Amino acid sequence: PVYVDFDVPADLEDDALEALEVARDTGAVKKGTNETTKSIERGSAELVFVAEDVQPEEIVMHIPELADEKGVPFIFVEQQDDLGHAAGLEVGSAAAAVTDAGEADADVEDIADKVEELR
Amino acid sequence: GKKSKATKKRLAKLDNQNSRVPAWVMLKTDRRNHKRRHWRRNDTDE
Amino acid sequence: GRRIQGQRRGRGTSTFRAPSHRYKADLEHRKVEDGDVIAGTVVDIEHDPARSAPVAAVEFEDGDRRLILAPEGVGVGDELQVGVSAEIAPGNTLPLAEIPEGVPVCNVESSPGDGGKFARASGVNAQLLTHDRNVAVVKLPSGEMKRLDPQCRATIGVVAGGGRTDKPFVKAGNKHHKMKARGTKWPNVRGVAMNAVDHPFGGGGRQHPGKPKSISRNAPPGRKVGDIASKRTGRGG
Amino acid sequence: ARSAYSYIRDAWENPGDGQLAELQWQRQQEWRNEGAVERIERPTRLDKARSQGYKAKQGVIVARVSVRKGSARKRRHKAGRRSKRQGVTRITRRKDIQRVAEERASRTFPNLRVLNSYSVGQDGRQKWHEVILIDPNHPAIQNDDDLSWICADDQADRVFRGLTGAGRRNRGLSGKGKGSEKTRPSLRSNGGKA
RNA sequence: GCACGGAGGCGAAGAACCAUGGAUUUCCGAAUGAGAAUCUCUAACAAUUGCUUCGCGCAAUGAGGAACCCCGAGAACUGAAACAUCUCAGUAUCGGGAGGAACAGAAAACGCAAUGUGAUGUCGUUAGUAACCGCGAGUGAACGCGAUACAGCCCAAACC
RNA sequence: ACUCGUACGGUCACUGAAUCCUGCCCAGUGCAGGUAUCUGAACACCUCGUACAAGAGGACGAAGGACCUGUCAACGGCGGG
RNA sequence: GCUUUACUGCAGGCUGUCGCUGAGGACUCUCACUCCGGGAGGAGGACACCGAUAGCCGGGCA
Ligand SMILES: [Cl-]
Ligand SMILES: [Cl-]
Ligand SMILES: [Cl-]
Ligand SMILES: [K+]
Ligand SMILES: [Mg+2]
Ligand SMILES: [Mg+2]
Ligand SMILES: [Mg+2]
Ligand SMILES: [Mg+2]
Ligand SMILES: [Mg+2]
Ligand SMILES: [Mg+2]
Ligand SMILES: [Mg+2]
Ligand SMILES: [Mg+2]
Ligand SMILES: [Mg+2]
Ligand SMILES: [Mg+2]
Ligand SMILES: [Mg+2]
Ligand SMILES: [Mg+2]
Ligand SMILES: [Mg+2]
Ligand SMILES: [Mg+2]
Ligand SMILES: [Mg+2]
Ligand SMILES: [Mg+2]
Ligand SMILES: [Mg+2]
Ligand code: NA
Ligand code: NA
Ligand code: NA
Ligand code: NA
Ligand code: NA
Ligand code: NA
Ligand code: NA
Ligand code: NA
Ligand code: NA
Ligand code: NA
Ligand code: NA
Ligand code: NA
Ligand code: NA
Ligand code: NA
Structure with a gap:
């Protein structure tokens, strides 16, 4: 809500998660907000995921601004357990990271662009 | 005044304690009920 | 020094409380979703122990039976209406805006919805002087010029x-x-x-x-x- | 580099600025309609929570507690009382609002014992604090090395004995030096002079 | 049984008596299905929680105890030759709670200033000293030393 | 609480049926209203001062008061020459 | 025990100021907060309420 400065259509969102699944099998992904946050600082990230249904918000409020001053592209996901599940987890996840994707470095790139245009 | 099944038992005990010490306990101890409660002179509880 | 009598009252002991259990009912206006369709018949005329004034028993269409503050001139068998499009007859309850200027009114709402507050006792009445889209100036029995929301309901006639x-x-x-x-x-x-x-x-x-x-x-x-x-x-x- | 936690901790250093302030102004609205003792599922201040003892385990409970703002709701003396003891408005309690919160909570959850507590905002007529409680009868914690001790009998109803962290702070037992003459080892064994 | 009568019975199948473990153990009582001056009415963890197969399924609290202990609330007579600060006194009394003991406790310490000591209680002393006080009445420590007993530890985060 | 109440009320006081009437005084005291100017605390604002602080001073100024009016079926008064 | 223009206080009332508390010496607005409404919404609006402080009054009370 407060850190969410734009709305992401359902389909585009579906595309992100589809990619996240093959990425966890081919490249590398990071689960949980701590690991994900650390990537944005180490630079080893390419695309980040942030759930919109996070309470308390504080756990995430830092992602938008932190990723923007490091160039690293991002995206808003509705559900939590969808991101959690999508990252190959049984639980849920406030945020996951795309630390070098796999078999979708093209799709990922395009997605990161559609968002850049989505403002 | 009406009473309860309970009260009616209490009154009864209160009346049994009001009997004298058996003439036989007299001889066994070789020698007085300190709790003799008259109806008019004394007052029970309740 | 002991507390004065005025202070004992504040406690709200029995000696000072009002005999509520003996009272009949709180005379409030009728809540209408809208339409003004609501209308009923005057069944009887009773005496309210709480105000020393009379009171009218009324039965509406939808089955509702509730005693209302009886103005002067209402009898058994008569008909009353509650709403925006209600007729300008003695007793009919409607917002101030719909009421023509210069007509005696009673049981006026201080805020719309509350169900009346002003002009309720024996033989009194308010007086509607002005109209506006914003204001509605009423003359309360004490003579004060009360500025009101024209949306506030009020009964036509004197108590x-x-x-x-x-x-x-x-x-x-x-x-x-x-x-x-x-x-x-x-x-x-x-x-x-x-x-x-x-x-x-x-x-x-x-x-x-x-x-x-x-x-x-x-x-x-x-x-x-x-x-x-x-x-x-x-x-x- | 900096952990995700360190962000939440920093944000809370000035709860009146930025996103947190926009957050406080929101929640608080929903917080004022909520009861006194409400069990929330997750700590607002995850960092502080963890840094106090928090763990995402079975038997670890958190809860927010709202208390009226103010001074001694002290009634005036009815009998003869000299000018000095004639106070009602000014004088305040010797027990801080945070500690009052811990108790209202421990009571609400009888069987649970109080780990720690922490502030989570305040408006013009109330203050909020969250509370970490633990179920000392749950095997998870009886087996957890890091919390095990809370099960000890001599830890039962600890918040009420002032054994909290917020308790010892209120009792004037911070500094092991100057000033602590009248507080260590306890207020009662010092004739209550602090 | 006390309790030494009368009648009778028990004990060598080792009674009584004592020790330890066990059985039974009415109703009220925190009293808990609900109501009640110890009884009643038609299946019960009442109430609040926790885990939860989300079913009271597994559990927790409640109340007592001579005083001691811990956190809160906190007098006045009285002393000051009156009396308001001060004193009585953080005393009496009240509220909540723990154990067999409590509490405190491994320095953001001491500051015999040092090249020095090294968790915390408690005892002795320092000392009626320093400090406070209508500078009146009165209140009143610490470091240190000498002893007792000694004991040291774990998270949070970085990095996984 | 008053209040299932709404000024033809309920609160607060005095006088105490009907009848005939109830004079003069607002100086003081009280309550209420106004008030150019005067008085009037603290924060913030200024200068001074202190590498900070204590503290000295400046400006502004609320209620209140001064000042004026109202008021006795308000406390109360109704003389001497 | 009672009284008062006895001494010292205290509730309480009035008042400035601080926070709650936001948008563009006089003014607009709405989002906090208030009240009414069953609701939709209506009214008030950074005031009121409440916490702190300051000055005046203050035998109602000690
Ligand atoms: Cl506890
Ligand atoms: Cl030493
Ligand atoms: Cl009358
Ligand atoms: K005294
Ligand atoms: Mg008097
Ligand atoms: Mg009466
Ligand atoms: Mg009513
Ligand atoms: Mg029972
Ligand atoms: Mg005395
Ligand atoms: Mg004396
Ligand atoms: Mg001790
Ligand atoms: Mg003297
Ligand atoms: Mg003393
Ligand atoms: Mg020392
Ligand atoms: Mg009359
Ligand atoms: Mg008289
Ligand atoms: Mg007289
Ligand atoms: Mg009379
Ligand atoms: Mg008399
Ligand atoms: Mg209301
Ligand atoms: Mg007196
Ligand atoms: Na008798
Ligand atoms: Na507890
Ligand atoms: Na002290
Ligand atoms: Na037994
Ligand atoms: Na139980
Ligand atoms: Na259950
Ligand atoms: Na004396
Ligand atoms: Na005397
Ligand atoms: Na020495
Ligand atoms: Na003194
Ligand atoms: Na006069
Ligand atoms: Na006058
Ligand atoms: Na007397
Ligand atoms: Na008199």
Whole structure:
């Protein structure tokens, strides 16, 4: 809500998660907000995921601004357990990271662009 | 005044304690009920 | 010093409370979703122990039966209407805006929805003077010019039982009976008749208040007796 | 580099600025309609929570507690009391609002014991604090090395004995030096002079 | 049984008596299905929680105890030759709670200033000293030393 | 609480049925209203001062008061020459 | 025990100021907060309420 400065259509969102699944099998992904946050600082990230249904918000409020001053592209996901599940987890996840994707470095790139245009 | 099944038992005990010490306990101890409660002179509880 | 009688009242003991359990009902207007369709019939005319004034029993269409504040001129068999498009007949309850200027009205709402507040006692009435999209100026029985939201409902006509005050009680017995049906301590012992301990005007070798009767608004309870914040007294001048 | 936690901790250093302030102004609205003792599922201040003892385990409970703002709701003396003891408005309690919160909570959850507590905002007529409680009868914690001790009998109803962290702070037992003459080892064994 | 009568019975199948473990153990009582001056009415962890197969399924609290202990609330007579600060006194009394003991406790310490000591209680002393006080009445420590008993530890985060 | 109440009310006081009437005084005291100017605390604002602080001073100024009016079926008064 | 223009206080009332508390010496607005409404919404609006402080009054009370 407060850190969410734009709305992401359902389909585009579906595309992100589809990619996240093959990425966890081919490249590398990071689960949980701590690991994900650390990537944005180490630079080893390419695309980040942030759930919109996070309470308390504080756990995430830092992602938008932190990723923007490091160039690293991002995206808003509705559900939590969808991101959690999508990252190959049984639980849920406030945020996951795309630390070098796999078999979708093209799709990922395009997605990161559609968002850049989505403002 | 009406009473309860309970009260009616209490009154009864209160009346049994009001009997004298058996003439036989007299001889066994070789020698007085300190709790003799008259109806008019004394007052029970309740 | 002991607490004065005015302070005992605040506790709300039995002696001071009103005989609620004996009372009939709180006379409020009818809540209508809208339309104004609501209409009923005057079944009977009763006496409300709480206001000494009359009261009209009414039965609506949808089955509702509720006693309402009976203005003057309503009888058994008559018809009343509640809503925006209600007819301008004595007793019909509707917002101030719909009511034509210069017509006597009673049981006026202080805020729309509350169900009435002003002009309720024996033979009184308000007076609708002005109209606007924003305001509605009413003249309350005390003479004050009350500015109101034109959306506030109000009943047309004067409150029944007019002329009660006109005839004296004649005897203590009769007053006593009136007071018993109210949350008021009666009779009343003048504070000057009490002891020094019991009230500021108490004590002394004779009956007189040692302090001047008028008193400041700012005074604490326990001393706030007599002529309160009087803007003046007497009649002379 | 900096952990995700360190962000939440920093944000809370000035709860009147930025996103947190926009957050406080929101929640608080929903917080004022909520009861006194409400069990929330997750700590607002995750960092502080963890840094106090928090763990995402079975038997670890958190809860927010709202208390009226103010001074001694002290009634005036009815009998004869000299000028000095004639106070009602000014004088305040010797027990801080945070500690009052811990108790209202421990009571609400009888069987649970109080780990720690922490502030989570305040408006013009109330203050909020969250509370970490633990179920000392749950095997998870009886087996957890890091919390095990809370099960000890002599830890029962600890918040009420002032054994909290917020308790010892209120009792004037912070500094092991100057000033602690009248507080260590306890207020009662020092004749209550602090 | 006390309790030494009368009648009778028990004990060598080792009674009584004592020790330890066990059985039974009415109703009220924190009293808990609900109501009640110890009884009643038609299946029960009442109430609040926790885990939860989300079913009271597994559990927790409640109340007592001579005083001691811990956190809160906190007098006045009285002393000051009156009396308001002060004193009595953080005493009496009240509220909540723990154990067999409590509490405190491994320095953001001490500051015999040092090249020095090294968790915390408690005892002795320092000392009626320093400090406070209508500078009146009165209140009144610490570091240190000498002893007792000694004991040291774990998270949070970085990095996984 | 008053209040299932709404000024033809309920609160607060005095006087105490009906009848005939109830004079003069607002100086003081009280309550209420106004008030150019005068008085009037603290924060913030200024200068001074202190590498900070204590503290000295400046400006502004609320209620209240001064000042004026109202008021006695308000406390109360109704003389001497 | 009672009284008062006895000494010292205290509730309480009035008042400035601080926070709650936001948008563009006089003014607009709405989002906090208030009240009414069953609701939709209506009214008030950074005021009121409440916490702190300051000055005046203050036998109602000690
Ligand atoms: Cl009357
Ligand atoms: Cl506890
Ligand atoms: Cl040493
Ligand atoms: K004294
Ligand atoms: Mg009503
Ligand atoms: Mg009359
Ligand atoms: Mg009555
Ligand atoms: Mg009288
Ligand atoms: Mg008399
Ligand atoms: Mg008096
Ligand atoms: Mg007289
Ligand atoms: Mg008189
Ligand atoms: Mg029972
Ligand atoms: Mg004395
Ligand atoms: Mg004396
Ligand atoms: Mg001790
Ligand atoms: Mg002296
Ligand atoms: Mg002392
Ligand atoms: Mg020392
Ligand atoms: Mg309401
Ligand atoms: Mg006195
Ligand atoms: Na008898
Ligand atoms: Na008098
Ligand atoms: Na507890
Ligand atoms: Na102290
Ligand atoms: Na037994
Ligand atoms: Na149980
Ligand atoms: Na259950
Ligand atoms: Na003396
Ligand atoms: Na004396
Ligand atoms: Na030495
Ligand atoms: Na002194
Ligand atoms: Na005069
Ligand atoms: Na005058
Ligand atoms: Na006396």
